[PDB]
Specification:
This is part of a larger assembly, with 5 copies of chain A (about 350 residues).
Chain A lengths: L3 E6 L1 H5 L7 H16 L3 E5 L3 H8 L9 H23 L6 E6 L1 H5 L1 H16 L3 E6 L6 H6 L2 H11 L3 E6 L20 E2 L4 H6 L3 H13 L3 E6 L5 H7 L5 E3 L5 H10 L6 E4 L1 H9 L9 E5 L7 E5 L5 E6 L4 H7 L7 H5 L13 E3 L1
Parallel strand pairs in A: 1-2, 1-5, 2-4, 3-4, 5-7, 6-8, 9-11
Antiparallel strand pairs in A: 7-8, 9-10, 11-12, 12-13
Helix pairs in contact in A: 3-4, 8-10
Amino acid sequence: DSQTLVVKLGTSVLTGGSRRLNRAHIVELVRQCAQLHAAGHRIVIVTSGAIAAGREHLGYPELPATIASKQLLAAVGQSRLIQLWEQLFSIYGIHVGQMLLTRADMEDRERFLNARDTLRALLDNNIVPVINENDAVATAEIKVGDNDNLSALAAILAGADKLLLLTDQKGLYTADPRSNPQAELIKDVYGIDDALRAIAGGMSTKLQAADVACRAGIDTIIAAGSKPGVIGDVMEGISVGTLFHAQATPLENRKRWIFGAPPAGEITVDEGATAAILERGSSLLPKGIKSVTGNFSRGEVIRICNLEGRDIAHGVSRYNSDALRRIAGHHSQEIDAILGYEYGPVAVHRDDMITR
Amino acid sequence: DSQTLVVKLGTSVLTGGSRRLNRAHIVELVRQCAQLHAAGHRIVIVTSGAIAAGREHLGYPELPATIASKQLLAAVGQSRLIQLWEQLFSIYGIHVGQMLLTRADMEDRERFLNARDTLRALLDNNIVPVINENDAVATAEIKVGDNDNLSALAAILAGADKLLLLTDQKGLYTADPRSNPQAELIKDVYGIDDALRAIAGGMSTKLQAADVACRAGIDTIIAAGSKPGVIGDVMEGISVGTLFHAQATPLENRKRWIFGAPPAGEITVDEGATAAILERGSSLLPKGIKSVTGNFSRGEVIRICNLEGRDIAHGVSRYNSDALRRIAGHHSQEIDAILGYEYGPVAVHRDDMITR
Amino acid sequence: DSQTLVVKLGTSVLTGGSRRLNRAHIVELVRQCAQLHAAGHRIVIVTSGAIAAGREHLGYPELPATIASKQLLAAVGQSRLIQLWEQLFSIYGIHVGQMLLTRADMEDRERFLNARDTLRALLDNNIVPVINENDAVATAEIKVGDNDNLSALAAILAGADKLLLLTDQKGLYTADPRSNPQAELIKDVYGIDDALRAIAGGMSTKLQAADVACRAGIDTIIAAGSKPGVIGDVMEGISVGTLFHAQATPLENRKRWIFGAPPAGEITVDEGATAAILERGSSLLPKGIKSVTGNFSRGEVIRICNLEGRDIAHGVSRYNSDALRRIAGHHSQEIDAILGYEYGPVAVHRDDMITR
Amino acid sequence: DSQTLVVKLGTSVLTGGSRRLNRAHIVELVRQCAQLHAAGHRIVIVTSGAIAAGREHLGYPELPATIASKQLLAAVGQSRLIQLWEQLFSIYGIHVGQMLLTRADMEDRERFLNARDTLRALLDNNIVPVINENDAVATAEIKVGDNDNLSALAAILAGADKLLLLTDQKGLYTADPRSNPQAELIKDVYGIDDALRAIAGGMSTKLQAADVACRAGIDTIIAAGSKPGVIGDVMEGISVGTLFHAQATPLENRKRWIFGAPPAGEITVDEGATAAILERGSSLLPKGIKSVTGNFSRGEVIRICNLEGRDIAHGVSRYNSDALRRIAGHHSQEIDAILGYEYGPVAVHRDDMITR
Amino acid sequence: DSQTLVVKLGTSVLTGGSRRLNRAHIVELVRQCAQLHAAGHRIVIVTSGAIAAGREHLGYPELPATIASKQLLAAVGQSRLIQLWEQLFSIYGIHVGQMLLTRADMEDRERFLNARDTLRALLDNNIVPVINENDAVATAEIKVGDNDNLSALAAILAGADKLLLLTDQKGLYTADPRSNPQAELIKDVYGIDDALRAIAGGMSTKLQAADVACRAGIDTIIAAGSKPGVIGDVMEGISVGTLFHAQATPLENRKRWIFGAPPAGEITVDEGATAAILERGSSLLPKGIKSVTGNFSRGEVIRICNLEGRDIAHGVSRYNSDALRRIAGHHSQEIDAILGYEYGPVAVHRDDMITR
């Protein structure tokens, strides 16, 4: 039962509050993640703290406290941090891939598909992808976000089963633990309500990310990074901190994604392909394509109809309208010859359409 | 209560029986050693497996099975292994210094003193020294030995309190554990006897090293590398394997070292340094020297006598006879100007002399 | 026509007088050496400046000006310098190997043979050997030498054709170039006479090294490191600086080495082996051996005589007397089975004997 | 949704009725299997016809028609056929492993476990295992069986989802197709009854194997080898021939396997391990073992009880009683050190007990 | 004077201590075996090292150190090693047959007979049988045995005259050759005793195999694989290593085998067959069979009595009781017609019977 887990590490966890990175905690977490990976699970890491790496690499220079200095430090520390991550993960024989993503890329239909394909390839080739925010084109408000929303976006993109948010605190408490001895850590949360938001006054960003993940059908866990073996316990299901149960199911999220917008086009599908899609729930092949109507790009939701014209399914196109028209009615092995490139042997994946 | 601990790691422990180094076990042991170092103790590491590092670095070439190939692989793997040790120890902010030693250097009087000085400087500057055998000028008869005797020699050189020999077995057993369910692990050994040698049939080299270490007053412990927290337990004194108690005391070993060979010279000492040596057991400074007789080199044992001629102490010279003659009666700050170099402010250290 | 070249790089050349290594000059020299290596020649590098690398790696600490500090710095600088050398040589796809040597090993009969075998293996497997001085057991007087004599010793050990000593000066001048405008660069030297040592007043160590190398039949060239393409021009025979012609031939040096000491033993050789040795000048195999008389270690010069008893040749034994006695009369492929190790298929190599 | 499919190929299918193997059909089936493997599935191949390979390799000698000749031909053709299979599978970059199994081995408790572990390793390392019957120790009656029962045994061992029995005929017919034009191929069979046995008079062996597989909870399909794309259609679920539905569930088969015999021993399990087994259904670790009672070998079903002695589960031991006693209470990484070998880090796998 | 020889080659001999098979040594040994085969003798080869072949074929993958990995490697190395053996033997025009056997097969009465018949057919058709342990169903303790006991079992099965065990050492030594120069090679051994077992400490397995072979009346020789022409000298009779003379005679071994267990049945034999058995020592034919009493399987020891009921001989049945009952009193040419198969033209072979 292999599962996909996304781990978010804040700068406070990585540095321990100091000016530099604390590599002992990082290597312990890497050991736990390597155990999980060897167990057969898929791990995706979202990290931060490139500024500390940049400061360390430059010999801690005396720079003015401007956003330009922060951008410079982030630019150097991106490379420095990826190098550190690969050095630490090479101890257990695990390769690391770098991903620089922004929210605008998530919004775009085609860029989302490209990022999903790249991440899926990375995961299928047993490579742990390290995902950070592209600070080259980011703003200060995005910098204050600390990749919290980015973690939820990455979890949605990867289709992960659990999302773990490591922080300094043990999780969510009923009241202030310092003032109230009776204040207790909340264990299970089923619905994020305004009362919970009032209780926790970047914990608010963590709650927002947890709500976003839960609305997509992904369980969210908030725990303390300093807790030993926290990742393994989260993987096993043992309670270590505040848990946010998934409000919906992944199929609901797929329906929401497919039917969120009206179709941008329609294509004609032969009878055999129609039967395969309906009876067996198979993906759509370019051979069964008979006619392409309208104009659209790769990743846009399109309408699928049989020869009779009846709506049979709604799905996401893996090719643009022109390419689909050109490769219609050909064997999947000739797509590269016809187009000069290939996005895969299928026109619409089975998991990417809703049959109706 | 700072103590000096020497850890010996065979190729079996490092590689786990494979063709390549297993870095998970090594990083765990490094974590334990770093905890001990942070606790304030001094750690010296004797390592092997340069051949494995050389094989891995060269892309595993198909070299002929010859001693020349082994020397080739050792030459490359020395640098590769020191690099690996430095990378692993830098995680906890600890620097690593390389030292290559042979038994011939230990036998020599002057080279022993030079190696001791280098190791003492490394230990005083909070740097973990990594000791290996110089395979460029080595022979196969010690290549089969796997640094077992070199570990004891290094323990003697460093003035260590405990010597730990990590191995595959849990230690020493009364009988064969496989054949005899009643066979149990021997916990304490006070005198290495012929019966013990007959019991263990390469445990023989480890027994010889343990005997050599115990004869010099150093406790020897044999344990299993795979045992979790072995180094910490050994440091605390908890029983984890076969323990060989020290048959002698460090004072006895010093007496043996001083009186092992006849004095190679004699020096004359004024009354002030005589009172310093006798009443307080202080070291000897070049100011107190009045006359130097005989020819000797650095490290030779010399005879110390007062103005009358009565013998007061025997000690190990830190300068050769010519240098002592040239710097006699001068302040310690002028040694560098007079000679062009210096070996310290004292002519004979208090710990290298025996008052009588 | 492959040739063996030994390049000695002092600390002044490596650092340019600064406190840290200047990697631009080093990478240029590495480019020249890589060109020569790809051309089919054999390159041996004698380096220095470990103290600079140790200072740089430690963050330039405020160590007291003591020899203990120098040894402390060298202990880390050795590893750092070898890492730098391998990084620079890996650009041109050339592997490197570390060899730590002392003059005492060169004086020894057996350690000399072991070092020669290791170096020959390194050279035959297309690996550039980097030779330095073992500072763990070295003295201050050796430290002030700066590997001038070690360079000549390594040149003799490697059987090199040319020894190149890079320095700051352009070469050797008849008079002081600064004071006397007409003072010019001496081009060729045929004998190091008293006048030459009078002219050059640390140039004296370089003259001593050149004398040692030329006495063994190796051409010594003194040039300036900053000169562009100096190594290539030295290889092609162009004049770039003072050249010291070889006073003797390698055959004369071999005779001096063989007949320097009386033979330590004697062996009896078959008539077939006699025919191989006398007419054809071949090596000696263990099959032809019948009786070994006397006790000797590996590397000792022994006497070879036929069955009737007359001397035929004197050579250097590759095995000790006991091993030769045990393996005499067996095929060369059984040596490992008989002894548990081997030093090669021949008992006395052709180049290590003088037929008479 | 990866699935494990076992394909059995008879001699008639491989040779097409000729004296020699017909490699065109074999390479077509290999192409289909390679497509399935690249799709992410697991394939196990049971083959025959080694006698034909032996005849072809020996140049078709004129041997007497005795069982000894057939045994010799099988002995040569085993190697020849494995070589042919690996050559054909290397075209698509798939490695092939050979396993020789007999029914008596499956009957043994320990040999069954060893074979299962070997097959699981082969499948997990993406290697197609080719399974045949060891004809060296087999009898003539076993030879007439044509690996039909062996195919079902291998399917049970691998835990396959479907079993395909290629044959000359299209499958099972209601009547004789030649005599009766109204005779039709039976598509689905839910229970093998005596009427079906009477209908088909080695088709009977095929029915026996199908019944054995169905009673184990594995679907059995009988089709014609000459049918194009038969394997792909079979795995996709398209009907191509007689289908035998699974009478029982895999959990029923596991219960039958576990409770077939009374436990041969009992062990004591700590409270934490008891909670892990009960609450989470995890496997048993050697650390949680507290006492081993009775004598048993690896693979035997044993009784698991908590500290209170209550019977909590029944499972299959991966180690013998002596090894379990010796390694009880130790961390899994020390099993190899204690025993000299390791059967895995767990005592009993979670799939290998029934919690009660 | 044709003789049968069994040669056992350990992994150390095959690989020379490296990670891969050294084919020069193997081809030399194959050349010697081919010369012997051409001379008219019979050769049986027992080999190991499938793990090395599996590692080489799979591109030396990085597998975890577990017995599962060893089984995975062996599953491919078996085919690779058989292919290598047949490739090397085809140079001299000799075919090779594969035989996978285990000790349990030797224990079984009928499997022993089947293996003996297969091996006899292979030998009679000038095919060298290559024998290895079936690692699919083997245990770790079987792997550590290195086919030593299996070699003796195969020698017993084949009825070989000599058994040759190639090893790294030159043979059995009175004392340690390294420590004691007076230690010499024990040329002849007539009885394996406690002192011999104490002298040699995997030499113990070799001694056990030699004892087993000697008690069966087969000479055992331990020599060094690297020795040139060892196989030819062994066949000729030259002393190349420790020789273990046969303690018993083949007739004694046959009597021990026959009378090891009481007869499982009895048959009635006509007077002509009785006369042939007693006077001429001929084998028993199905024609002379008069009655079959009791039930038994092929290979079981049965009791032979004449018409009067007097016991005449004890032998081993080549058929089961039912088959003998069915074919009793019929000609040998009709056995195949009656049974559909034939185990030979005789009921009990003369060499398998003991007249009494």
